[PDB]
Structure 1
Amino acid sequence: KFPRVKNWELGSITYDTLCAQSQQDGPCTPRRCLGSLVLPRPPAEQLLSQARDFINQYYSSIKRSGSQAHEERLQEVEAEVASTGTYHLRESELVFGAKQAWRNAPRCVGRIQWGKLQVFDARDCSSAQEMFTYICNHIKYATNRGNLRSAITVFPQRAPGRGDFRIWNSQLVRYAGYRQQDGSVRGDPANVEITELCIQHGWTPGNGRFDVLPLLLQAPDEAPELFVLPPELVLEVPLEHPTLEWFAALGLRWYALPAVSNMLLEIGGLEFSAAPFSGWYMSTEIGTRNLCDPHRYNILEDVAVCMDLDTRTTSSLWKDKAAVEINLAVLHSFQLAKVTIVDHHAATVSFMKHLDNEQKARGGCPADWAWIVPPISGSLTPVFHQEMVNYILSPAFRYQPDPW
């Protein structure tokens, strides 16, 4: 019926009634739970109902529900869909839908911010070089000289028979992954495949550990085009430790803008295949996952040895000790270069709050517990002790197959 959600630190309890608004289905069934899985796997009347629904959400949003503008706007969709098999959104609606899609992202812990979102309408894009410009402006704006501002740029919606506008990169900014001689990897290992694809389309490789990749933009039914980002637009932070003078000597650095760009944005039945978004980092994304994942830059042991720790046995907790300093380094550095960042403590505190604001406003909030809880010190944060319910609401950000 309705799930009972309990917080074991405060002993408080709520009842998620929002989950009932879930139209789309998840991986789990009563026989078994697959919530820890990272990845998973729409005709005439389906669209119309998704559209009506979203238009209803829109007008309830501005309070002018069931009014005239609503009834008429509902006729516009009906008419357009019935004649062309599809329809279009209006700037204001698109702005509402985007914000909604972010508000419903179950894996996002920065949703307390869902209200302030700079929505750029790039639906009038007709070429990869045009895409490049939009993408470049997003960056200038979002970055704001280290004073980050969450933004999104929405490109032409998908269309039957025509190919999808796509940004081939995972994020607008990433470091190359050069699979070398001995099967080893120089740079960021999660970017080997994409770094090759760029070379293959005529990119002159590099030889560093932090070579900022070029963007492959794709306009409908046309092979992808290569564009280089103006070194100036791409802000970066040099990592140095507060008390460890020797840290900086590691040359570690990381870009300031986190901007996923391969996710599909779905609103009122429409699918936007290229709609990059960015807010700001949570220290642990850089210091824990990006730099300490064994299959990433995996610098855990180096910093360990540098700290003269006992890498001999696990029980010395060298890994833990080293991981904490690496995160501290990030927080210090970013805070030194006056670039927006939020540690996992402050961040989870705010999400905890967001769950409260949401409990009041919608009777619940979708959350993926395994993703909301930081990669280090989970139990030390309020979120670890909070039960969560996870379901799919729309508007929504979804995953989509790579364009190759």
Structure 2
Amino acid sequence: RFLKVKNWETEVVLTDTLHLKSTLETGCTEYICMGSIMHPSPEDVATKDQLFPLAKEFIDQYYSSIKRFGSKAHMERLEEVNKEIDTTSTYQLKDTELIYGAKHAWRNASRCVGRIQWSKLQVFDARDCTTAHGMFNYICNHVKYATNKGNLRSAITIFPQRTDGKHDFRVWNSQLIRYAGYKQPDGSTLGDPANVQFTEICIQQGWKPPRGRFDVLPLLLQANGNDPELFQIPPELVLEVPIRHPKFEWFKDLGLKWYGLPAVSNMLLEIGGLEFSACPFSGWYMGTEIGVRDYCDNSRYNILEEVAKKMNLDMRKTSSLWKDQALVEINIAVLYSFQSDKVTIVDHHSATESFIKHMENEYRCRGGCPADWVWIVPPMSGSITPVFHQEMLNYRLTPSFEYQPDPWNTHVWK
């Protein structure tokens, strides 16, 4: 009813009433908490009986947000939706409703630390698309608009909603821009180990790999349930940063670069019981996503030993903390490099500070802010960011972004 959270660093207490509007399973029970489990646990289509309540609840909340609850427009819209569901088994969102739904799914993303920007989101309605070529064109316009010569802008492109489950639109790429990974016969991995499987799918589909360390993968686009199709993103639209270090002249000899635009394309946008299986959305990077996870995860580029080596660090025992020392210098390089090239990025201190400020405002104006602590806290120097000491309540608000099966596991080929 009235739930409390405390910041153990500042002793500030906040009061959550928004949790009364939560919905689909945390996955937790009174006996087992699953707050550190990554995912939960085809035919999947909603019926008329399932869709009426979900649509109504979304429409109700839309009109309340525009200060028109109970208005004639509100009542007529419900009637229009209710009739459309009854005669067609689904309904279409108005443009205003789609923009509202997209922004609130981001606002509701428990795991996103960037949510302070949630209302400044550019929504591209691609519901008139019918083909993978159509999708490719939409996506290139997304990438170019968002990139903006390095002054990045948040954006989402929404492809037609799922109908009977058999004509989905999907982006098979997990992110719009990622580098290929080639597993070698000798066991090693050239490129990005995380993408070996998807790279092989692309090669099989006919992609000709240049077999390099930083090869931008082609897009694999699926329209209306058909076989997916390959397209090369135009290289001039793919902004990259060469990674160097302000103090270590040799850091650039590491030959490192990253792409400037993070763009999640494998998730599902649920608005009023409708499912948008293809909705690629993009923002800008927090430094540690590249500097900690992309470069230093043992199952990724894995450069700590090579960086430490160059730093002449004693790597005999772990208690020398040579990993900790090198990780910091890498993340200094990555911020310095993006900043030097006027490409938008945010370090993990600034980003966590703004999220606390965002969180407190949400409690004030909105009565709560779901947050997944496991994901909000950065993967280095955790306890010296303000969110480490912040208690957080986690629950699912709709509209929301959701995970969905990898399309290669589900598709029925022809």
TM-score (norm 1): 0.99
**1:38 aligned onto 2:38:** yes
1:278 to 261, 282, 285: 282
After superposition, where does 1:253-402 map in structure 2 within 5 Å?
253-402=257-406
| Corresponding residue of 1:217 | 221
Question: What one-letter code is carried by the residue in structure 2 that aligns with 1:90?
Answer: K
| Corresponding residue of 2:411 | none
How far did residue 221 of structure 1 move? Answer: 2.7
**1:106 aligned onto 2:110:** yes
Question: What one-letter code is carried by the residue in structure 2 that aligns with 1:38?
Answer: M
| Corresponding residue of 2:12 | 12
Question: What one-letter code is carried by the residue in structure 1 that aligns with 2:145?
Answer: Y
Question: What one-letter code is carried by the residue in structure 2 that aligns with 1:25?
Answer: E
1:205 to 200, 209, 218: 209
Aligned equivalents of 1:58, 1:3: Cα separation in 2: 25
Aligned equivalents of 2:192, 2:330: Cα separation in 1: 17
| Equivalent position SS for 2:164 | coil
Unaligned stretches of 5+ residues in structure 1:
none
Aligned equivalents of 2:222, 2:187: Cα separation in 1: 30
Aligned equivalents of 1:152, 1:294: Cα separation in 2: 32
How far did residue 163 of structure 1 move? Answer: 2.1
| Corresponding residue of 1:74 | 78
CA offsets 1:49-101 (integer angstroms, 9 cap, x no match) = 11011111111111122111111011110000011111010111000000000
Question: What one-letter code is carried by the residue in structure 2 that aligns with 1:66?
Answer: G
Aligned equivalents of 2:169, 2:232: Cα separation in 1: 18
2:142 to 127, 130, 138: 138
| Equivalent position SS for 1:54 | helix
Question: What one-letter code is carried by the residue in structure 2 that aligns with 1:241?
Answer: H
After superposition, where does 1:89-238 map in structure 2 within 5 Å?
89-160=93-164, 162-238=166-242
Question: What one-letter code is carried by the residue in structure 1 that aligns with 2:12?
Answer: S
Question: What one-letter code is carried by the residue in structure 2 that aligns with 1:20?
Answer: L
Aligned equivalents of 1:242, 1:183: Cα separation in 2: 35
| Equivalent position SS for 1:195 | helix
CA offsets 1:301-359 (integer angstroms, 9 cap, x no match) = 11010111111111111101100011010000000110000000000000001111100
Aligned equivalents of 1:173, 1:396: Cα separation in 2: 23
**1:62 aligned onto 2:92:** no
Aligned equivalents of 2:223, 2:24: Cα separation in 1: 29
How far did residue 162 of structure 1 move? Answer: 3.1
Aligned equivalents of 2:276, 2:336: Cα separation in 1: 37
Question: What one-letter code is carried by the residue in structure 1 that aligns with 2:38?
Answer: V
How far did residue 193 of structure 1 move? Answer: 0.7
How far did residue 161 of structure 1 move? Answer: 5.1
Aligned equivalents of 2:225, 2:157: Cα separation in 1: 21
| Corresponding residue of 1:28 | 28
CA offsets 1:126-160 (integer angstroms, 9 cap, x no match) = 00000000000000000000000000000000011
Q: How large is the Cα RMSD of the aligned pairs?
A: 0.8
| Equivalent position SS for 2:123 | strand
Question: What one-letter code is carried by the residue in structure 1 that aligns with 2:120?
Answer: K
Aligned length: 404
Question: What one-letter code is carried by the residue in structure 1 that aligns with 2:155?
Answer: A
| Corresponding residue of 2:412 | none
Aligned equivalents of 2:96, 2:117: Cα separation in 1: 19
Unaligned stretches of 5+ residues in structure 2:
409-414
- Equivalent residues of 2:23, 2:395 under 8 A apart: no
Question: What one-letter code is carried by the residue in structure 1 that aligns with 2:25?
Answer: D
Aligned equivalents of 1:335, 1:66: Cα separation in 2: 49
| Equivalent position SS for 2:136 | helix
Aligned equivalents of 2:151, 2:168: Cα separation in 1: 33
Aligned equivalents of 2:19, 2:304: Cα separation in 1: 40
How far did residue 45 of structure 1 move? Answer: 2.2
Question: What one-letter code is carried by the residue in structure 1 that aligns with 2:31?
Answer: R
CA offsets 1:32-59 (integer angstroms, 9 cap, x no match) = 1110011113332221111011111111
